[PDB]
Amino acid sequence: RVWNARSLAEALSGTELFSSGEAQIELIEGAEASLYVIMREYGDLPVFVAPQGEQIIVEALLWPESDVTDATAFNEEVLLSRQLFPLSSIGLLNLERCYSMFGALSTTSSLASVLHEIETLAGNVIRATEVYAGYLKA
Amino acid sequence: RVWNARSLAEALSGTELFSSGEAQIELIEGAEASLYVIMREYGDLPVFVAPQGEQIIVEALLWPESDVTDATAFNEEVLLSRQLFPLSSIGLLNLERCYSMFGALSTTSSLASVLHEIETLAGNVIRATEVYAGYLKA
């Protein structure tokens, strides 16, 4: 009737991307489980997958705020270039502050939609470093 | 086999929100059509709905960049508060620069998902003025 970390992890495990080992599930058992996806073909990029009532959040880390030469100019450029990355947008997090790439989809989206979002966010993260490299230090 | 402005406008027209007059379709005929949704219950807030290959874009205007007291501080706050608005994120556009609220969903999403995104984005726009008012001039 709606996704939870456990049910979503099971569904994802049965897809080709995971059955083939190109990605793997890391479900953290606890009070309420936390789902992580490791994109093996993106250098083991970990992706956080969390249902949250009004949306399913899919998030990955970009680079620390310290790696940005001009945070002021980069912030404005981020808001001007939403078009650059389909289905996901860049954010700022706290622990040192880090730039993230998050996607959001309906709490009742299909498995294919959730899968597509994860795959797209991973590709977007690599694309961010490729299209924003000029703003980085080294 | 995938949404276009015309087919999406037809589907939306048959939903309760539009059959009741609480929202209405404004499809601009031309070379390739452009779809707009007027949220009558949000002060006739116009919403742009456009399919674009890798995503369906849903966008509305927030306020001109001139209405923001400290664009530098507001930009950083926007990136820190993604959680504030589910399913949509804030951006910057050009004609004078204006702050926008855009949502993105799969090119094959269900009508209910597209409808939910539009409704949520409208509510988010009102919420943005309510939660960010301190950053505005008057």
Numbering used by the authors:
A (entry chain A), B (entry chain A): 37 to 131, 135 to 177
Task: Pull text from the paper.
The present study focuses on the PA14_16140 protein, i.e., the PA3732 (BacA) homolog in the PA14 strain. The role of BacA in rhamnolipid secretion, biofilm formation and virulence, was confirmed by phenotypic experiments with a bacA mutant. At a molecular level, quantitative proteomic studies revealed an accumulation of the BAC cognate partners by the bacA sessile mutant, suggesting a negative control of BacA toward the bac operon. Finally, a first crystallographic structure of BacA was obtained revealing a structure homologous to chaperones or/and regulatory proteins.
The domain search performed with Interpro database1 revealed that BacA is identified as a DUF 2170-containing domain protein (Pfam PF09938) belonging to the YjfI family. Nevertheless, the functional dimer conventionally described for the T3SS chaperone family does not correspond to this « asymmetric unit dimer » but is reconstituted by symmetry related molecules, issuing with two dimers each one being formed by crystallographic second order axis. The Tb-Xo4 molecule is localized at the interface of the two monomers present in the asymmetric unit, participating in the stabilization of the crystal packing, trapped by the N-terminus and Trp-39 of monomer A, by Glu-112 of monomer B interacting with the atom of terbium, and by Arg-136 of a symmetry-related monomer B. The 3D structures of the two monomers are very similar, with a two-layers alpha + beta mixed domain, and adopt the α-β-β-β-α-β-β-α topology characteristic of the T3SS chaperone family, with an average root-mean-square deviation (RMSD) of 0.6 Å on Cα for the 115 closest residues over the 139 amino-acids that have been crystallized. All the variability is localized at the N- and C-terminus and in the three loops linking the beta strands on the surface of the protein at the opposite side of the 3 alpha helices. Two residues present alternative positions, Glu-90 in monomer A (A-Glu-90) and His-155 in monomer B (B-His-155), these residues being localized at the biological dimer interface, in close proximity. One molecule of glycerol has been trapped in monomer A in the concave surface of the twisted six-stranded anti-parallel β-sheet in a pocket formed by the side chains of 4 residues (Tyr-72, Phe-84, Glu-95, Leu97). The location where is found this glycerol in molecule A corresponds to the region of interaction between the chaperone and the effector in the structure solved of the complex formed between the multi-cargo chaperone CesT and Tir from E. coli, Tir being the first translocated effector in the infected host cell via the T3SS.
